[PDB]
Amino acid sequence: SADKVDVMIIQAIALLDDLDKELNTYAMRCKEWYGWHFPELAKIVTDSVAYARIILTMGIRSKASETDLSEILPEEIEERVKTAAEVSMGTEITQTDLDNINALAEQIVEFAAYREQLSNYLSARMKAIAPNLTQLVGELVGARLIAHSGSLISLAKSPASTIQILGAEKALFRALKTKHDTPKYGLLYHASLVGQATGKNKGKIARVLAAKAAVSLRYDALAEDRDDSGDIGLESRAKVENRLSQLEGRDLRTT
Amino acid sequence: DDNMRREVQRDLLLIKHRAALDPKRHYKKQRWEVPERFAIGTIIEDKSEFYSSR
Amino acid sequence: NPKAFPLADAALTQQILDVVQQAANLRQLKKGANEATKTLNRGISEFIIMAADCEPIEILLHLPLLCEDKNVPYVFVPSRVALGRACGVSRPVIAASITTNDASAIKTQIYAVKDKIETLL
């Protein structure tokens, strides 16, 4: 079925990482380029997309007097740029200069728009190719796991121990050879469930989450007539949450 | 870090005793105890001196 | 106001070329712009002579930026064609520089013109 091919996940995630790098690069460029005209904006507004949107709304510091930045910026931020505008050290620019830099701001926002479109597309794919994991571990983590193995079957063949430390190979193999201590979390650390845990409970839930992840995956990968519902993931998610609740409930300190 | 990576350990040991490294050089006399704050960094060449010092 | 500035008068040009023409005999003279550019960065130059009639004059206006950044006196003179005759080379010279040597036989002559040059600037 066209809706159950994992080669698309591995391409999308690779593309998603590439977009972040390139979108970041251009962000500094509009910062420095318009930084010529108005260097102070970068310190005030750090967000690249917000930085670009300001440029589209107002082009020149003179426009800051009348232009309204409420939708882009809160009240205290928008007033600060206005004060910076009239007291700016930057030099004036031509409209031909203005047009090109404005196109960059248009370029920035469009890729910010596409990046979310790719993110939504990736989520839809996983919920069709591996619904249970998206329920248990999540979308961003699951695609990266599948991409690491290169195939759903390959990761479905990875035992839970390896899934747990899938992304810590260097510290793993280094530590194993030097008779020093080994990883615990691997790629799964950026999952939600590990997040809510605290202290050493991080390691515990990582082991427990990895075990259930394999259970969900082997159902997702190999099930001949899997319903696209994630039920096995949901029930597995319930168990680990129960495991977390009792684990975090324990208090080492005497009361 | 307290790990004190061995490559950094020897490296600091090659500049404490730097006098013996080449017989023609003969630096000043300095004890050079290890400091408690330092970093390892790479000099970088500029485009004009591609030939001379790269 | 003019780009070629300051420009030595008929008199001050006179002692300059006399230093230049002799300095050539003593192998103390580097002749032409790229040698002028050469000496400034190495900081071996007393002061630099430039022709004000150079075609185009801007071909050598980079040298004063180098010269005064290194705090080296410089000056302009009317006719390139005369400088080559002083310099001893069979072609016009638009820029020339006197190299540093406290052991030169002409330290007093060079310093004499140098002092006048500083006052002119």
């Binding site: 066209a2 007291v87 196109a103 794919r125 | - | 790229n34 550019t37 050598l60 980079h62």
Partner: protein, 385 residues
């Protein structure tokens, strides 16, 4: 005998009144000098009576020019008139600059200006405490206004202009090639993505930019019509015959059909690639125009892009002009910009690039007349060797 003090702040003019006059005989005694440092004692000496902020950035510069030249501005005239009482005798006003004194006296015959050390000490005290003396009055922050105003006052007399500015060249270069890698990287991804659906077509149209447009039209291979064949035939030319091949290969291919959501990403992603090529061609033209304006001699002598790259290596057009001929040669010796007889032209041409940079860099509005003949000189040498 000082009753009023004039102080100028980047936000505006400030006038103060001297409640108490410090001892002049012991003016240099340590205790009185310590008072100028001490706010508590200093506040007893003077008080702020009037402050007139400048309306905008422009007004500060003109007054900054006027004060530099010891001239009384309209703004300065108004504030003094409002505050200084009419005067048999003359009201005494403290001013930091003596040159300003005669100008004030001309406008106001009834005021006598003082600029002795006693005034200087008070001026020193006022400038020391700064905003603390303004007692909550809106003076902005003095440090930033100095930065902006001082920035403005600088370029004014040196006559710096955006025309001399050559950074736009440097940034666009790194932007032009940055675009080039990304369009190639993204376009290749389009080929792999659409390659699964219809792998043969990726072979048919090797030109990536053409391929993205054709994928945009041919979203699904199954849709094959004679009118569509004409439409894709209009795309590029039928001389290659690809228009017939795509219809034939589309009919018989092993490509697995992809989901509609997949297809939407392919064309939208292909749309992103098209925009960057659209901007890249726009920016490239802008580089050509800017270079002709900034460095006409280099542009004519070697070419807009090549001259642009040289400026980037030197870091600035000014940097390139300063360098000697030999340094300019090795500046472009890593990417063969300037490239035994072959080397001789390279050494020869490198000098002409160097002199041309000098002509463009220091001319307020360079022309291309010299670049034309200088290039012609190179052509004569090229034929000779």
């Amino acid at each position: 005998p000082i009753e009023y003090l004039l102080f100028e702040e980047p936000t505006g003019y400030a006038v103060f009144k001297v409640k108490l006059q410090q001892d002049d005989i012991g003016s240099r005694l340590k205790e009185v000098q310590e008072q100028i440092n001490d706010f508590g004692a200093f506040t007893k000496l003077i008080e702020l009576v009037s402050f007139a902020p400048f309306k905008g950035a422009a007004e500060a510069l003109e007054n900054a020019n006027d004060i530099s030249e010891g001239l009384v501005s309209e703004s300065l005239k108004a504030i003094l008139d409002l505050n200084l009482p009419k005067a048999k005798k003359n009201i005494t006003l403290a001013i930091s600059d003596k040159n300003l004194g005669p100008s004030i006296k001309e406008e106001f015959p009834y005021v006598d200006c003082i600029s002795n050390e006693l005034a200087q000490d008070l001026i020193r005290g006022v400038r020391l405490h700064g905003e603390k003396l303004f007692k909550g009055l809106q003076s902005g922050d003095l440090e930033r206004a100095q930065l902006g105003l001082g920035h403005a006052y600088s370029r004014a007399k040196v006559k710096f202009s955006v025309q001399k500015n050559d950074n736009h060249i440097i940034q666009a270069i790194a932007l032009l090639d940055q675009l080039d890698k990304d369009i190639n990287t993204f376009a290749m991804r389009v080929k792999e993505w659409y390659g699964w659906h219809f792998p043969e077509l990726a072979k048919l149209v090797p030109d990536n930019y053409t391929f993205a447009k054709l994928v945009l039209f041919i979203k699904d291979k199954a849709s094959l019509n004679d009118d569509s064949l004409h439409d894709l035939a209009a795309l590029l030319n039928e001389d290659s015959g690809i228009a017939q091949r795509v219809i034939d290969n589309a009919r018989i291919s092993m490509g697995q059909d992809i989901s509609e959501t997949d297809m939407e990403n392919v064309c939208v992603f292909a749309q992103r690639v098209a925009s960057l090529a659209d901007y890249r061609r726009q920016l490239y033209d802008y580089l050509c125009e800017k270079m002709h304006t900034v460095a006409p001699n280099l542009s004519e002598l070697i070419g807009e892009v090549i001259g642009a790259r040289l400026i980037s290596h030197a870091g600035s057009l000014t940097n390139l002009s300063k360098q000697a001929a030999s340094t300019v040669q090795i500046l472009g010796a890593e990417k063969a910009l300037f490239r035994k007889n072959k080397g001789r032209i390279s050494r020869y041409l490198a000098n002409k690039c160097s002199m041309a940079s000098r002509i463009d860099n220091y001319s307020e509005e360079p022309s291309n007349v010299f670049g034309s003949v200088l290039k012609k000189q190179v052509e004569q040498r090229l034929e000779f060797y």
